[PDB]
Amino acid sequence: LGVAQVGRMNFGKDVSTLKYFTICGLQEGYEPFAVNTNRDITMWLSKRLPQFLQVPSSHEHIEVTRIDVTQKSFGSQNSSTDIMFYRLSMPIECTYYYSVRIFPNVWVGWITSDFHQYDTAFDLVTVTLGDEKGKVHESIKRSNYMVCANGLEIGCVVGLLTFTANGKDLSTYYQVEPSTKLFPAVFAQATSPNVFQFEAGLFKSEHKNPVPQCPPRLHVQFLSHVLWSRMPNQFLKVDVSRISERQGWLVQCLEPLQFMSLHIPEENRSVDILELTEQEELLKFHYHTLRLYSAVCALGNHRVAHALCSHVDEPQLLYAIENKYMPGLLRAGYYDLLIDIHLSSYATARLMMNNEFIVPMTEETKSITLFPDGLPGIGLSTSLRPRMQFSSPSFVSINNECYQYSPEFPLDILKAKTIQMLTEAVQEGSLHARDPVGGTTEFLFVPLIKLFYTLLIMGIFHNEDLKHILQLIEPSGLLQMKLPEPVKLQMCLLLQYLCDCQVRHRIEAIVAFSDDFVAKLQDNQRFRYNEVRDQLLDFHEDLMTHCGIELDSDLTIRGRLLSLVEKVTYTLQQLISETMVRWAQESVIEDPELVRAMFVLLHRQYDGIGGLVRALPKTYTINGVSVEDTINLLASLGQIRSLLSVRMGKEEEKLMIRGLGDIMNNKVFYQHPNLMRALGMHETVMEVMVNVLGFPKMVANCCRFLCYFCRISRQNQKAMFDHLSYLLENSSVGLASPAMRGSTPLDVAAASVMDNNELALALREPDLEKVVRYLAGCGPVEGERYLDFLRFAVFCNGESVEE
């Protein structure tokens, strides 16, 4: 535009207002812009107010030099050497001098950043108070901003303000400024080239961190900015809803509409966030700051999660989800940050416990059918389901904030917003809408699906929205569309979790039927004994012989229930395989993790037996009476599995010992070695003990627990047997021999032998070879451990096993 003129532009979206383009244009082959999209296009018009920009090499000719007292020269060998302002970079807090030298008309002051005057003169502030009339009321303000005029001039530090001039003192010093910030500011009317030189320390004391600060220095961060006229700036996308009158003039706006901003603090100025799409250095840097914030609260630092909730303040993230113009890097960053604060702890806990399947035998866990004549999201599953608890990050209190769990968020509101996001995105990004939310379809889709996946894991979305999203994707569409690579690499985990929930439903149903069937056949055992040589051989022979001479008892009721289960074993199973083959037949694949996940899902479709093969020897049933200790031990064991991957680890061992002592004191650990052996928790504790060695009190605390685990059942002792060679090569000095003597790795190895004759016969010769290699003493003391282990290796039963 020029002086007082009007623009009228059409960037697509305006087929109803094409004045001449259906006439000529579209017929010849041209196009509008935004035919597909719903968005507008923002415009970066020119501003008016000057903001002091950096100094490029591409000036006309004005060139500063970086010279170490710490001087910055000039040169302007041109024609136009008149109007060039020069504000400097970094401010003063509210003692140290700062001298300016001129080689041959020159203003010197201390400018606060609220200053944009583009005028060549001395131009431009006395607020009043009251004691209901005043009487002092006036010592307030003059700054708007600050002007003085080979000379050497110093605005020294502290607080007050100082005006000196070549040793002499010019008058009218403005020594009153309580809480502002100032810049060393020198303008220019360059009468000649070689016009300035700049600088018992200096401003390096004031600005930077250290303040002994006796040697002064210009750092690299010190720029020498030039107040250029304008930059392109954004367009204030939605502004006005004025309702008013003209007799009464009821001028009224009722707008919930917020900005989204930041300010670079070192050159203080507020800037809105979503303008930054072209400020690529600041883009990359604030992206990396979000990535660091995601890195910091990774896997358990919940105290620091409270800290980041103080910083970034979760409803700000909620507004950051909705913004349909924020760039994709900020989009991925904030989508990661909401996860890595509020979700990933309970998420990774359930990801660890997704292979345990244990379920009590109560009344709710009993009325479950098989699939009748696609809905895995049913009402079921009190199968021990480690519950979720949260915190409330206030910043006034104590007790304790370091074990407190995780910060909160608007749960159902969040899931409704994600449902809205998914539906509206699927409706938009289908026809090649040439403007996605973040620029491409990857930043559009990928972290949305990541958030939806991690939210789907967390046991939210009661069954209505499950039906909604399923036959949104199913209809029986989402997956049927054309998609890029990491999008479906994300979606494969959705399909994983769907099939896994199907497996959970399947196993809970088979446990219910097993309860009914065992009740019936237990009564049949009662009557078959009460009718009268096949006595119990430890009750495994009884069930094995029941299924063995019943490999087709042998009542027809038994055969009917057998046929009932073998028709329980018999429409997603179609479409998953169909679409995996469909993807792989067309779209020659990179990122081999995608190939991995695809074909793992494909084999897992065709081996529905095999999941039930490798799932059932890790499930277990509880009576229903002692469930509270089971919840407590599952919570303790989940947080000790999370403690496995700290890794180092020097002061969380207090939490480790507290957890292990509770696992000791839990009642279920006494009577249920099936459950403890089923959790794999001995191997967990053992690998923790591996990680501790290649010497604190942690080792003996582990070895005590292994030894107490070796003394509850024989099959437990078989389980703790086979670690002998590694446990032996650990056991050289590892514990017990200042005077500790309670447990040690060698004490664990001896703890797995003492009862059973069978394990005494099972062990072999190179182990004892390594033991007598370790018997290479010269004095001493710790050979008593080797001899003690051999004593437990030779005799064991009242007579020595002679081999």
């Binding site: 620091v304 103080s310 206030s394 910043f395 006034v396």
Partner: protein
């Protein structure tokens, strides 16, 4: 110690007692103007108890000073607050608090 402007008066006389539920909305930014906490913003009306010694001393004495429905600027001394040691991560060492607190209900 601490000097607190009543921004807006509440009912003036209803100052609480130890054993009465201190249902509050509050927020607060630092001396520089940067925010650090906002119980307004997560839409949780905060509760505590004076005498049960739940909050910092400046916020406790300011809640003791105010009345029902009294929005007030509770600028507090840093050494009454965390102050020198600071809240390690949230509040820097030796920073003065500036509040915006209004009492809601009493039980």
């Amino acid at each position: 110690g601490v000097e607190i402007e009543t921004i807006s008066p509440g009912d003036g006389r209803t100052f609480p007692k130890k054993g009465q539920t201190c249902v509050v909305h509050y927020t607060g930014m630092l001396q520089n103007g940067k925010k650090f906490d906002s119980s307004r913003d997560r839409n949780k009306p905060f509760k505590f108890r004076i005498g049960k010694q739940e909050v910092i001393k400046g916020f406790e004495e300011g809640a003791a000073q105010m009345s029902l429905g009294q929005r007030a600027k509770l600028t507090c001394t840093p050494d009454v607050a965390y102050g020198a040691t600071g809240h390690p991560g949230v509040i820097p060492p030796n920073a003065t608090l500036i509040f915006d607190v209004e009492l809601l209900n009493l039980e």
